[PDB]
Amino acid sequence: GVEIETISPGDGRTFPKKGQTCVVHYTGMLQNGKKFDSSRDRNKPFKFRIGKQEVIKGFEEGAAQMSLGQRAKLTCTPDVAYGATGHPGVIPPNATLIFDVELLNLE
Amino acid sequence: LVYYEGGAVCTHARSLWRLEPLRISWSGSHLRWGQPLRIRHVTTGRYL
Amino acid sequence: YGESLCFVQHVASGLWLTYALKKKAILHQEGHMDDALFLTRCQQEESQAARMIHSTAGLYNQFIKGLDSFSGKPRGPALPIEAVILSLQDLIGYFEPPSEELQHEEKQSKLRSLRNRQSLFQEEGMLSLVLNCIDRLNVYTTAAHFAEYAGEEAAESWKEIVNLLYELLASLIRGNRANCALFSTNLDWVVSKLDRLEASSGILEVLYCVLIESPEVLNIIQENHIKSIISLLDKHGRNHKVLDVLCSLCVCNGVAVRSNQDLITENLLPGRE
Amino acid sequence: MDILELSERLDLQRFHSHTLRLYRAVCALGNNRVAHALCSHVDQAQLLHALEDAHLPGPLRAGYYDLLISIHLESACRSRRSMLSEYIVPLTPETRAITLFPPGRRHGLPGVGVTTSLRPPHHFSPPCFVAALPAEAPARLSPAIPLEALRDKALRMLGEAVRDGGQHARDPVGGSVEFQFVPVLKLVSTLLVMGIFGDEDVKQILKMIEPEVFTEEEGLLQMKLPESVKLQMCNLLEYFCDQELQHRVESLAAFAERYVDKLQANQRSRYALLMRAFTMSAAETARRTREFRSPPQEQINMLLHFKDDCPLPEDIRQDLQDFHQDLLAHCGIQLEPQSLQELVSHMVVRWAQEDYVQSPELVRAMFSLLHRQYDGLGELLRALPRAYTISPSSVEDTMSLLECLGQIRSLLIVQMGPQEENLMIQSIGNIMNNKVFYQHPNLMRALGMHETVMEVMVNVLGEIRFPKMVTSCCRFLCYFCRISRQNQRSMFDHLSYLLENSGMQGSTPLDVAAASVIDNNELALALQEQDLEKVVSYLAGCGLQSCPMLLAKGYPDIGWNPCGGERYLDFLRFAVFVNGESVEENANVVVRLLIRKPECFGPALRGSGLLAAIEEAIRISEDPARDGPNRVHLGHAIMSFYAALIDLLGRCAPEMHLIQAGKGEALRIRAILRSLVPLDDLVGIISLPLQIPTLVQPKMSASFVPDHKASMVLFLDRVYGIENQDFLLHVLDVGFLPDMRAAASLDTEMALALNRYLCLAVLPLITKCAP
Amino acid sequence: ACFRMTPLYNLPTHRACNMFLESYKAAWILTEDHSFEDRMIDDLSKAGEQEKKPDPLHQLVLHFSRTALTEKSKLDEDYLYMAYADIMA
Amino acid sequence: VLQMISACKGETGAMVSSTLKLGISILNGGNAEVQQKMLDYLKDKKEVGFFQSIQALMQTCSVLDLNAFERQNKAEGLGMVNEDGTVINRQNGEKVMADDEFTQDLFRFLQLLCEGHNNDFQNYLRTQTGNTTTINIIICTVDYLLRLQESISDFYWYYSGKDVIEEQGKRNFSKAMSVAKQVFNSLTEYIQGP
């Protein structure tokens, strides 16, 4: 399982339900603070669908606690994202995934 | 044991022969029939 | 020349030497119809190149078995040490590559003369015995602590002839694709020694030219080699030479090898250190 | 630390630039998986931030430019350079209206206009790092980039970079005027062959290169530039000579349907005015030599005959001679510097006038351009075998083949591995139902797709490496040979090499050679006799030893291959026999060879017997431990080799009408052929019965079958025949009557291999001897 | 089979232009005689007009010699050499 | 043109076909200094391989072939292939003596090497002193036209029987001696100066 340490919430009334867009402007970070991914630089917000099992599930069920406009430094266990194989060439196995996400709109 | 060979062994170093006549002085004189000598392979240092 | 068409015979016996591919020529007293032959002319370069081989093989094998005479027995004959100093120096100069500041249309005549005199060494042996004289030398690990088998006076030159012995390997292997194919069988020879800490940049440059001349040795490596390559990069600083040998291992001659285009990314890029 | 310290650290610079050599090498030649991998270590924003910084040092400026086009562009670049030279033209009305000079005999602009030739799109994919891992992957695409902004980037990147050269400031961007221009030009050349520049960008680019001529300031072709800057413009000026060539070929093909549609009607009007007239009797056949008596190639040949016996009227014979007078007017023929040819011929000679060039690949490219501005017709004529004309309804299926084709053509450079060999199976298999490959046999060899699939079989072949692709590839080639006439002719030339790879259940590249000469009497007597002797020498190779694949399963080592001959003598059977007739120029030359080396015959033919070796072969088909010890068997192989030896000796016997004429070869070839195998030994084979199943079942795969027997009745039917009566019903009573009554029992697997032994191999022998 | 062959006007119009070019190439393009080689070889040779360096013909000849001196395995096919040997001759 | 002959090592490609035409055009009309410039380059560089790469060429030149002849007759026994396909007539076409205009230009080349009674060349074509090996080109031309003699005399015995000569047999015989006229013309220019 994951935990979520929030930064700055937004509306708090809305939460991601089934059949919805989910547009995030996230970045990434390995556990030593050595980042590898940031959708903010290429100016294109990541737009993944809910429940379709196309994102890694640590990003998925961790996004369930999010609200609209909420910014939250979450984290991920090794067992929820690339456990013993890793992404080949990019991240080694058995490594946590500290993130930094915020939701734009449309749940 | 001495043999023959084909075509690749021709240009290589194993198919070369030094011609040593008997007496020392005027060794590099012109050769003729009936002139005794000594064949030696140039890499082995051995004589036939 | 070219018009003789003559024979020879053991004139003190009258015997005609004649045959019987591997036609063994023997002295036959009969005399036959197949001992007529016309003789031709050699050339001035390889006549020079022949005799120095016969000097070296008598010199190297004298050096070889003199070393093995005390291969296991420590001390409390002599070695030709000062002989094999100088007789290795000229072999470097005899196999010297031509310079870039030379005129083009003459530099190939210098270059063709080199190629036809480095393959003339590889076929008369001269590769086994230069390998057979280094492995029985690199059995000793420290400088003098395993040169105590001979003596402290003969110990100082052990450091600076193994520098020379890896140098002449790179002499007669550079550019020769035919001689660089000879290392397909024993790639674990060189990578068993590339962190031997003495003449350590010597063996590195041996491996660099064999990885650029023969594409046959590229597809016979696995990840056990590559982790032994990248560990050299971590033990010897930020060497600019060992980014070239990683690049030359990847592609060759417009051909890409995807079987290890991934293998030098699973051990370099996630580490980030 | 700041990266701009590297202008003065001088040791981390030459180490970091060597790292930059490792990134653009590890993803070289289309490695779109790992091109996504190190999209993390360099994000795209810092890549196009360092692309325009001024005070970066020398090699690191050209380092990062060489990474960008090798992480984002060279995958889609290489799959366009290998398809620009080929042309195909569809029939849209936009194609139906195009011409040579713009409507206003003054020239136009290169690259500015319309272009109708087919080119597939590129299909980039955006990168990500949180998608789940799929578990034989389909493919990986190249990582994307914002392209519409990058085309505006490189213009204004170059735009002040050219006028600043006019300022001649001695602090150049990057440290040298070499580094100021080399990376900014070689990006523009790659963005131009990608074709994504708009048709007014190239109007604006042409003003940078030569403003004094290309009007519809400083000049690029007027400054003193060094050697390395020059050949990038030669790579740039190579593009603007192809589009002039590409425009006229598209216009000339457009002239065809403008001309033949009004010439398709002029034979309808010419035939209707002739199919009812009653004018003459004998001269009407001189009119009747076209409409049902001339093939459609030779029809339009005599229709096009007029220059300096023609059915064409004087009105529609004029507009062709207005076109042809305009086409060479468009090229360099004056037909008695405000043109592109006059400029690029002027510049290319005054470069050599000024300095003495030393770099070799400049003057190789330098002289090759000006040859393409004098012999403009020779440039045109060496591209017309690439052109084609296609119906507009079939466009949607052709691009599926082209996009499949470039997937195969990219596979030429990668050394073979186990993943991507699956990526040619469906890449081949999707051609096998594209529905256009089966109806355009002229286009497929003008694409040269049979050449490209040939060497990928060769390079893996160089024991064997990958049997699951050589069987799949050469089977396509055999199906390629069986399409048209000239596709067999095109694949005919390579049997010189294809015979040199004769060294496995399934198909084989040797069978492609046999499929290249089957059912063509023209090809057979045009075959070279310097090719047969290395096939019968290969027969000597299988006549002396056993193959170690038979020793892989512990079969006994016998000193001649039985199954190696059955993969040779089948090919010779198609070499001396076409359409049921025996050729004579090849039948003589094959029997000289295989008697000059008697080891091509087995060890029973030197000194055992035929029927002796057959009887031992029957008995080892009974004793299983005497046979080898799973589909490959032993005793059936020997009794099929000697059986398939005789039938080629059968159908190399000369035809009967060459015996009525006493031509000394045709009755001495028969003399040798009658001498080898005696007649009575043939009686022993044909008289031997078999085990029948009822309406239990024997296994034909390791047993005596009538397929051995049918090659015996054919041999007697050609070199011996039936002359008298008492010989006939002797061998009829002992040979056929044991079988055909037993064959009449089953009125089923074995019967189907028995009735056709009767119904096309012994019953035509009966109707020949009926009187 | 010399009588059952079709006339032109039953053909699909995309197949008329396929054989039209193959007729137009070998009857009209190839029949033209063009003699540009007279004035290509002289202005390439008169081009010593500057203010003992080689004129551009001497650079072209020296380039082909240095391609013929590299000790390769065999002489490969250079089609650029083909379209300058006759243009000289 | 002296190097690319020596750089071929005896292959009958289109390179030596297209580089001899420059050779017989730079040596045409019996020029004098351009063959004096040819000799002294050849006899100080001493590159043995110019006289190997033509002795290899002269062996691979064809003579008449009866066993290839009637193949070309039976090929011409058909006029038009089925389904309105048109047979390319002279694509393969002349199957015998297909290398005639090549070998009609090889001897035409080195005849002009000794046209103006260049006395040094008629002593150089049979021996070369400075090189390690001699070749004796003017011996090797005699072995070639000897292979012409029993070739075309074998063509005479084939037509000894029948009365008249047809069209294709006529033209193959005209090609047979127009090369033999060249090899005689090139033979007598080794001998013309005494």
Numbering used by the authors:
A (entry chain H): 1 to 107
B (entry chain A): 244 to 291
C (entry chain A): 341 to 360, 372 to 427, 434 to 630
D (entry chain A): 1648 to 1751, 1758 to 1788, 1793 to 1873, 1923 to 2014, 2020 to 2047, 2091 to 2216, 2222 to 2262, 2267 to 2369, ...
E (entry chain A): 3634 to 3684, 3693 to 3730
F (entry chain A): 3779 to 3972
Sentences from the paper on this structure:
The molecular target of diamide insecticides is the ryanodine receptor (RyR), a large ion channel expressed in the membranes of the sarcoplasmic and endoplasmic reticulum (SR and ER). RyRs govern the release of Ca2+ into the cytosol, driving multiple events, including muscle contraction. Diamide insecticides directly engage and activate insect RyRs, causing uncontrolled Ca2+ release, leading to tonic muscle contraction, paralysis, feeding cessation, and eventually, death of the insect. Therefore, we designed a series of insect-like chimeric RyRs that contain the diamide-binding pocket from Sf RyR and the remaining parts from rabbit RyR1 (rRyR1).
The individual mutations R4563K, F4564Y, C4657I, and L4792S (rRyR1 numbering) significantly decreased the EC50 values for both FLU and CHL, with the largest decrease observed with the L4792S mutation. The combination of all four mutations fully restored the high-affinity binding of both FLU and TET, with final EC50 values of 25.1 nM and 46.1 nM, on par with the values for Sf RyR. To gauge the impact of diamide binding to chiRyR, we also obtained a structure in the absence of diamide. This reference structure, termed ref-chiRyR, was solved under the exact same experimental conditions as the diamide-bound structures, including Ca2+, caffeine, ATP, CaM1234, and 2% DMSO. In ref-chiRyR, Lys4563 and Asp4815 form a putative ionic interaction, which needs to be disrupted for FLU or TET binding. Notably, the structures of ref-chiRyR, chiRyR-FLU and chiRyR-TET all adopt an open conformation, as indicated by the distances between the sidechains of Ile4937 in diagonally opposed subunits.
